[PDB]
């Protein structure tokens, strides 16, 4: 990403940004106050709904600052008691993109008439008292191609002072084409800052900024002033790393040079790998990564807090123990890792007769040590087979035994509120952010507000939900035969088991919540053996009410046209294991129902063959065991960011209507595909027989270079886009690291005799060696073939003056790794050229405590003064005792219109008493009590820039005045 200055550089700015997350729900909208490189979250005060059209926002810790957003005006007004900022002001300063009032998510084509506002920039600054003083930021018109709006001017208030900005356009960086089938809104900054003009009543300035185009990216070369022969600041970059160049020389305003020297430090990476017990795993979280192990024969569960690399160098270690519930052998556990709390679901087993599911939650911050929330386990424990859970930053919601529990923290950290409403008939379930979309006679949506108020909205106007009716009909139109024909009662259990299996498998994956549209799918069978799927779509408004209802239908495979070809083994024909027969099976209609029936058999070269004598009687049994052979996983709905995948089709958004488009079966059969990973690299499977490849094509050269990942299958491989790809072939693993920004691949690494774990992650890969049965955690940086990583760091900085030179040298040690960043725990700095001549400073940086300890070191490598920072801070406090200057914010002083500068302070009594007044007739001071005999003071009364004793203006008085 390039700012207006260039890469690596950011120009200051302030605004308010919207983060909706492709949904229109009023709870998920997040507002961020951005000042330069800093962001603060805005939090809606839901306790005061206002009918004027404007809603109220405030921040944690600052209730004295108030935000008021007027939606109809597209305006934010925000103030403390002194100064108000106005953001947005509709067409003046609003970045808005085309998006519907019900669907913020991606679409295929957009409606330019419809629009919604995503960012409000700072339009105006003013003072609550004496509104005359102000500042007005004027921005450019919005750019339809790339929705970026650039600052144009900072207009005057009373004395004319303007600061104009002018810009240069980039024709290369702007995007060439969009290849997305469903298109999202993307923002691109295609302009650089060329010149700044400053016209103030004191001074005048015209500055010009020039840049260098290293490779395909711009960087700030220098700032020059017009009519000044030398650059004010010069920057010269080092390109020792092609993808990331860093500045190595700076030219100061005093025309003296400062150079930095870069060296490539080699650190061995075997130290970062670690081996741990068989029943121990490391699950990576966003902010903290925790390791859980099973201690006494699955009876108890030790939790241990770790870091991104699996050590305790970044985050302090914390030991938590989970006790056995009722002495039950643990079968599985699932950890979830939220900011305030960790929640582990644990599945205990009683003799396979029952499976209990207890939710242990461990809530603490950072200052306090993690410990169990010792709360009465009334509803955090159940044993039912329909147990659904969903964990969120602010809440979590469960469903057990026909009951929807919902625990939330509002306005208070240390207590969880409980709320629950019983629900009845359950056939297809889904849990949303703060509620559950349950299946009933009609489709209903129960939800809890941020105030805790229950809201039951039923979403069914027209005919809907024929799920059960359509499915049983699908089941009964085909006769399925039990496993053993001789006993009908025994086979009746098998047919019931299949019918229950089909009901649960179809219903449990037949209710999706894609963004803010609830989709419900049903499938049915005609007399003619035809399958039709019908998906009903419900678009929801911002207040969780039905924006729209739609119905679309698609076709499934006919049973008459469907055929199954199996390679099969006939031991009574040939002793060769690979001379297999093949059977064709098809559904044939007998009486009123379809029956699967064998058709014919051929050899492996498709010449007909007599079936085996034993197989001739066994084949009827094997048709009974086969029961219904169909691709039933096709009918269930898999949801991604773009659309909803059902029956080889994608349901997407198009001009406000949800439309279904043909999804190519070949990609879903994993035989051929091209998945664009990034700007320049794409995951490619060229054909069926070809192995998995990763083709890349940089912008400059039109040469496609594909690396091969040594995998014919696509189920083995896993994608973790910005970093390594990984694939498990046979009992070995292969890892392909990726260069940053998808500029190409890296050297492949292989780990023999190891089994991959599902806990593997962007930060670290955890595997299990089969020979030793001890699991091994390797951080991302540890995945290096030559077993050493280079971290490029500065070696010295040299200040060059025409009179002297000065060099400060640095070395680093005790590295740690964290994601893609190396950091050093101990840095040694020498101020002179020679270390052995004068000694050095050794600064140890603790990453968890964020406190650095400087030990001053003698030239003989001996500590002269440990903790030298404390000495200098004590000294600073010691010299601060005699001086005092912390006095302006006093209401007793007479101040200006703005209030910056104290005109007159009165110490014994305050300004509120009108006992002392002092009027000097000037611009910044406004006083209305000194009315002239005619009328109050005007410009025709005050003489300006004529000779006074104090200031610049005075007052001229005639006889009548």
């Amino acid at each position: 990403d390039m700012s207006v200055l260039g890469r690596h550089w950011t120009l200051g700015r302030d605004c308010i940004v919207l983060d909706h997350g492709n949904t229109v729900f009023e709870d998920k909208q997040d507002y961020y106050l951005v000042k330069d490189q800093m962001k603060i979250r805005l939090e809606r005060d839901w306790t005061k709904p206002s009918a004027n059209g404007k809603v109220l926002f405030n921040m944690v810790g600052n209730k004295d600052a108030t935000f008021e957003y007027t939606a109809r005006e597209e305006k934010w007004e925000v103030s403390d008691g002194k100064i108000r900022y106005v953001y947005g002001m509709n067409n003046q300063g609003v970045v808005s993109v085309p998006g519907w009032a019900d669907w913020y998510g991606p679409s295929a084509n957009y409606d330019s008439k419809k629009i919604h506002s995503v960012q409000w920039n700072l339009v105006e600054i003013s003072s609550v008292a004496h509104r005359d003083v102000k500042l007005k930021y004027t921005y450019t018109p919005l750019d339809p191609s790339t929705h970026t709006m650039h600052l144009l001017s900072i207009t005057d208030d009373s004395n004319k002072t303007t600061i104009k900005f002018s810009y240069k356009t980039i024709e290369g960086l702007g995007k060439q084409v969009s290849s997305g089938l469903v298109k999202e809104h993307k923002f691109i900054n295609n302009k650089l800052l060329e010149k700044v003009e400053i016209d103030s009543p004191s001074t005048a300035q015209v500055l010009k900024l020039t840049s260098t185009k290293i490779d395909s990216l711009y960087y700030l070369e220098s700032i020059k002033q017009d009519d000044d022969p030398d650059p004010v600041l010069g920057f010269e970059y080092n390109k020792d790393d092609k993808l990331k160049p860093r500045v190595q020389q700076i030219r100061l305003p005093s025309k003296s040079v400062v150079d930095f020297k870069y060296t490539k430090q080699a650190i061995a990476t075997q130290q970062f790998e670690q081996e741990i017990a068989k029943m121990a795993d490391l699950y990576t979280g966003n902010e903290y990564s925790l390791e859980i192990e099973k201690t006494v024969g699955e009876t108890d569960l030790y939790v241990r807090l770790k870091d991104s690399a699996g050590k305790n160098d970044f985050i302090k270690n914390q030991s938590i123990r989970i006790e056995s519930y009722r002495g039950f052998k643990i079968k599985s556990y699932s950890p979830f890792m939220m900011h305030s709390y960790i929640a582990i679901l644990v599945r205990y087993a009683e003799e396979k007769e029952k499976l209990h599911n207890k939710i242990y939650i461990l809530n603490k911050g950072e200052d306090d040590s993690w410990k169990l929330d010792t709360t009465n386990n009334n509803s955090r424990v159940s044993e039912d087979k329909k147990f659904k859970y969903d964990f969120q930053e602010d809440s979590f919601v469960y469903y057990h035994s026909k009951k929807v529990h919902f625990e939330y923290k509002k306005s208070g950290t240390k207590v969880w509120s409980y709320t629950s409403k019983d629900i009845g008939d359950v056939d297809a379930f889904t849990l949303m952010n703060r509620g559950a979309v349950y299946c009933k006679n009609d489709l209903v949506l129960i939800r809890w507000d941020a105030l805790g108020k229950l809201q039951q909205e039923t979403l069914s106007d027209a005919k809907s939900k024929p799920s059960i009716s359509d499915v049983d009909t699908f089941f009964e139109y085909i006769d399925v035969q039990g496993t053993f024909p001789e006993d009908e009662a025994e086979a009746k259990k098998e047919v019931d088991d299949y019918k229950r299996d089909l009901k649960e498998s179809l219903s449990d994956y037949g209710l999706i919540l894609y963004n803010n549209v609830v989709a419900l799918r049903t499938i049915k069978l005609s007399f003619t053996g035809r399958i039709t799927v019908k998906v009903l779509l419900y678009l929801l408004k911002h207040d969780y009410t039905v924006s729209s209802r739609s119905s679309i239908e698609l076709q499934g495979g006919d049973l008459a046209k469907f055929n199954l070809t199996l390679d099969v083994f006939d031991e009574h024909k040939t002793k060769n294991t690979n001379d297999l027969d093949k059977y064709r099976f098809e559904f044939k209609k007998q009486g009123s129902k379809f029956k699967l029936t064998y058709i014919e058999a051929t050899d492996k070269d498709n010449k007909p063959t007599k079936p085996s004598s034993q197989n001739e009687k066994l084949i009827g049994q094997y048709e009974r065991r086969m029961k219904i052979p169909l691709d039933f996983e096709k009918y269930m709905m898999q949801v991604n960011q773009e659309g909803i995948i059902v029956n080889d089709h994608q349901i997407i958004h198009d001009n406000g209507n949800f439309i279904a488009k043909q999804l190519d079966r070949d990609t879903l059969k994993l035989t051929k595909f091209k998945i664009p990973l990034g700007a320049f690299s794409n995951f490619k499977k060229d054909s069926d027989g070809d192995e998995i490849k990763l083709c890349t094509k940089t912008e400059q050269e039109r040469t496609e270079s594909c690396v091969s990942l040594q995998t014919n299958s696509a189920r083995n491989v896993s994608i973790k886009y910005p970093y390594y790809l990984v694939t498990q072939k046979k009992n070995d693993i292969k890892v392909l690291p990726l260069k940053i920004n998808s500029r190409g691949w890296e050297d492949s690494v292989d780990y023999r005799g190891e089994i991959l774990h599902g806990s593997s992650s962007h930060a670290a890969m955890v595997t299990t060696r089969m020979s030793d049965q001890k699991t091994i955690v390797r951080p991302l940086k540890a995945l290096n073939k030559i077993n050493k990583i280079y971290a490029q760091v500065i070696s010295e900085e040299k200040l060059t003056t025409p009179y002297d030179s000065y060099v400060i040298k640095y070395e680093y040690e005790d590295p740690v790794v964290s994601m893609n960043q190396v950091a050093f725990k101990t840095t040694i700095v020498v101020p002179g050229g020679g270390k052995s001549a004068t000694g050095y400073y050794r600064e140890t940086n603790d990453l968890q405590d964020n406190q650095q300890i400087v030990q001053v070191m003698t030239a003989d490598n001996q500590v002269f003064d440990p903790e030298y920072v404390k000495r200098m801070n004590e000294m600073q406090q010691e010299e601060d005792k005699q001086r005092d200057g912390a006095q302006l914010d006093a209401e007793q002083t007479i101040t200006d219109k703005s209030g910056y500068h104290p005109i007159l302070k009165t110490t014994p009594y305050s300004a509120n008493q009108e006992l002392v007044q002092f009027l000097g007739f000037e611009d910044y001071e406004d006083m209305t009590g000194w009315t002239v005999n005619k009328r109050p003071i005007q410009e025709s009364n005050i003489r300006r820039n004529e000779f006074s004793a104090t200031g610049r203006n005075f007052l001229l008085l005639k006889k009548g005045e």
């Binding site: 990403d1 700012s3 950011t10 200051g12 700015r13 605004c15 961020y32 951005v34 000042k35 330069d36 490189q37 800093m38 962001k39 979250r41 939090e43 810790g61 600052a65 925000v78 103030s79 403390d80 008691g81 100064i83 970045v95 960012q119 600054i125 929705h147 999202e184 809104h185 923002f187 900011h339 498998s505 199996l566 083994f569 294991t577 690979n578 094997y622 065991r625 086969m626 029961k627 052979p629 691709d631 039933f632 996983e633 096709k634 898999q638 991604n640 960011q641 995948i645 079966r665 879903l668 059969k669 994993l670 998945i675 994608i719 886009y721 910005p722 001086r883 200057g885 302006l888 914010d889």
Partner: protein
């Protein structure tokens, strides 16, 4: 899971208890959309809003009471006027310290060294 029967029948028809097919029956013409969904979820990490947040180093999900003065000072160095006005941070402003500097009066100085 739901279709253990057809795989069990196909698997029983293998030569001398040898896995010749190697999970072939699952993918003769049966689709595999969940694996495709996993690959698409893994390969797609797109940040589609570099409008105003772009180029940020630090962010606060809320304000910490202990760090109030630090965030106020870091906003103060950037010329953001909405907080230091109310917090009484006018002592921290360099222009006020150097304008109130009384010559021949050591009590008014603020020299760091």
């Amino acid at each position: 899971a739901l279709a253990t029967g057809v795989i069990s029948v196909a698997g029983a028809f293998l030569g001398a208890a040898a896995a010749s097919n190697q999970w072939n029956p699952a993918k003769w013409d049966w689709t595999s959309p969940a694996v495709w969904n996993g690959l698409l979820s893994g390969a797609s990490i797109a940040v589609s809003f570099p409008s105003g947040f772009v180029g940020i180093t630090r962010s606060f999900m809320s304000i910490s009471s202990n760090l109030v003065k630090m965030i106020y000072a870091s906003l103060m160095v950037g010329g953001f006027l909405l907080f230091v006005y109310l917090g009484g941070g006018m002592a921290n402003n360099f222009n006020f310290q150097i304008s109130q500097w009384d010559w021949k009066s050591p009590r008014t100085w603020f020299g760091m060294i």
